[PDB]
Amino acid sequence: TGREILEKLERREFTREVLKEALSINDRGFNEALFKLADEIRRKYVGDEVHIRAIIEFSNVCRKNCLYCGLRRDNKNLKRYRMTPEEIVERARLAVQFGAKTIVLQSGEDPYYMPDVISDIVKEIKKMGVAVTLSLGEWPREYYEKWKEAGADRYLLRHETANPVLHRKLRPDTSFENRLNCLLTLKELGYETGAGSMVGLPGQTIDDLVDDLLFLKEHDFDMVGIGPFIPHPDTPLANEKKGDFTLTLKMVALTRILLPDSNIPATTAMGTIVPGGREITLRCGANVIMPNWTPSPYRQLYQLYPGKISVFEKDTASIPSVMKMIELLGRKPGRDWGGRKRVFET
Numbered sequence: 314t315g316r317e318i319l320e321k322l323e324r325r326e327f328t329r330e331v332l333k334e335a336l337s338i339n340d341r342g343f344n345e346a347l348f349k350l351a352d353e354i355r356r357k358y359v360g361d362e363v364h365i366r367a368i369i370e371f372s373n374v375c376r377k378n379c380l381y382c383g384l385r386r387d388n389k390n391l392k393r394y395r396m397t398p399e400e401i402v403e404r405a406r407l408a409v410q411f412g413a414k415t416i417v418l419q420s421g422e423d424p425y426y427m428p429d430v431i432s433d434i435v436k437e438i439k440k441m442g443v444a445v446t447l448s449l450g451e452w453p454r455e456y457y458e459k460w461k462e463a464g465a466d467r468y469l470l471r472h473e474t475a476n477p478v479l480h481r482k483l484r485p486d487t488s489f490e491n492r493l494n495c496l497l498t499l500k501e502l503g504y505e506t507g508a509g510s511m512v513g514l515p516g517q518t519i520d521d522l523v524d525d526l527l528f529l530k531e532h533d534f535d536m537v538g539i540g541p542f543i544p545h546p547d548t549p550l551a552n553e554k555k556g557d558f559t560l561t562l563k564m565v566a567l568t569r570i571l572l573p574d575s576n577i578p579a580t581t582a583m584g585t586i587v588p589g590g591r592e593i594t595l596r597c598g599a600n601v602i603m604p605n606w607t608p609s610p611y612r613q614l615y616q617l618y619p620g621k622i623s624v625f626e627k628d629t630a631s632i633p634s635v636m637k638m639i640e641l642l643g644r645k646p647g648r649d650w651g652g653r654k655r656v657f658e659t
């Protein structure tokens with residue numbers, strides 16, 4: 314029964330079977346109660362502040378060939394771009410002028426910048442008195458060390474899928490073992506570390522989703538980014554089914570229940586698959602939003618999946634828009650960098 318699974322979630326009995334059953338029950342009443350539980354846990358542990366992370370997608374060049382991703386190297390039907398270091402720093406400064414307290418630098422795995430150009434950019438942005446998060450993919454330990462010395466605070470490296478077999482199939486350049494080793498290295502070097510997964514990948518099962526939740530709980534990540542798989546027409550997965558929004562939302566809710574003090578974004582992919590999806594997600598366990606700060610004419614070229622929102626508006630619209638969102642949700646913008654504030658418990 315749903316009521317018993319809720320009770321067990323409330324008492325923190327996070328067994329495999331309780332998670333499977335939560336993910337398998339499709340009853341509306343159960344789902345709504347699960348979302349209310351996550352919302353309430355969010356409020357109690359991380360409060361009403363919604364932390365704004367301004368993301369600059371500074372290059373869409375990638376050396377990898379992930380099957381799901383529109384930036385994969387085999388996609389010849391994409392105009393590739395690279396922002397200059399000066400452009401990146403000045404665009405970051407503009408976001409800080411607009412009130413961002415974290416700058417996220419994201420790219421394809423583009424060798425050009427690595428490691429020294431990144432280091433230089435990080436140092437310049439850190440002078441602005443904000444947190445810096447990197448989301449650059451898999452690189453040697455030495456690169457991660459250089460970036461940490463340069464002042465980077467956080468690193469986002471979604472684990473994608475905790476099924477090693479599925480991982481290697483979808484990400485043929487690498488492996489789950491490699492991805493995990495990167496995540497462990499980042500944690501050792503003192504980054505606030507983010508992981509997370511896609512929901513509704515071709516071949517992914519409900520037991521796989523359970524294993525994603527258990528993986529996340531085991532390593533106690535600071536941030537967890539979850540969104541649905543959205544097929545891209547210039548990829549091998551073009552004809553596969555999109556991930557289900559509701560199931561994805563349940564994954565966010567369960568993540569908050571499992572990791573009550575973590576930082577959990579309402580991802581752009583959630584807002585792409587359903588109009589108003591980020592706002593829903595912020596009411597079902599999430600506490601972070603990542604407005605797109607990539608400038609025109611590049612923004613529209615950073616196409617991991619189609620239909621991405623925030624492309625038609627002026628390139629400074631997103632920060633004001635999320636501030637309006639936060640207000641209409643009855644929430645508050647973050648006052649500090651929004652680092653993880655651990656609540657030690659039993």
Ligand SMILES: C[C@H](CCC(=O)NCCC[N+](C)(C)CCCS(=O)(=O)[O-])[C@H]1CC[C@H]2[C@@H]3[C@H](O)C[C@@H]4C[C@H](O)CC[C@]4(C)[C@H]3C[C@H](O)[C@]12C
Nearest residue numbers: 344345346347348349350351352353593594595596597598
């Ligand atoms: C806004 C709609 C529809 C509400 C509605 O329209 N219900 C009828 C009117 C009720 N009023 C009290 C306004 C008047 C009553 C007198 S009347 O004469 O109208 O009958 C309600 C119906 C179900 C609600 C969600 C679920 O909970 C799950 C979840 C819990 C989290 O925590 C917050 C997020 C989320 C997604 C909820 C958001 C929102 O809250 C929803 C969509």
Ligand SMILES: C[C@H](CCC(=O)NCCC[N+](C)(C)CCCS(=O)(=O)[O-])[C@H]1CC[C@H]2[C@@H]3[C@H](O)C[C@@H]4C[C@H](O)CC[C@]4(C)[C@H]3C[C@H](O)[C@]12C
Nearest residue numbers: 406407408409410411412413414629632633634636637646
């Ligand atoms: C960038 C330009 C020119 C002046 C400038 O370069 N300003 C640097 C401000 C730096 N900070 C954000 C760190 C100040 C924090 C002050 S605070 O008292 O909010 O802590 C300034 C002038 C007016 C400012 C907007 C309005 O105000 C309304 C609104 C308030 C929100 O809040 C943040 C978003 C928004 C849209 C503002 C963004 C930005 O800022 C604007 C465009």
Ligand SMILES: Nc1ncnc2c1ncn2[C@@H]1O[C@H](CSCC[C@H](N)C(=O)O)[C@@H](O)[C@H]1O
Nearest residue numbers: 381382420421422449450471542543617618
């Ligand atoms: N088709 C698609 N649908 C939904 N999310 C996708 C997607 N393609 C990629 N993503 C997400 O986009 C993220 C950013 S890729 C850029 C960061 C870095 N190269 C890296 O891979 O870590 C990936 O973590 C993945 O979860």
Ligand SMILES: */O=C(\[O])[C@]1([C])[N][C](C([O])=O)[C]S1
Nearest residue numbers: 469538539540580581582603
């Ligand atoms: O999960 C995240 O941190 C990011 C930044 N959100 C992006 C999206 O498109 O939803 C991809 S990773």
Ligand code: SF4
Nearest residue numbers: 375377379382385421
């Ligand atoms: S998911 Fe990241 S590493 Fe993989 S192809 Fe896309 S940009 Fe490159």
Ligand SMILES: [Cl-]
Nearest residue numbers: 366415446467
């Ligand atoms: Cl961050």
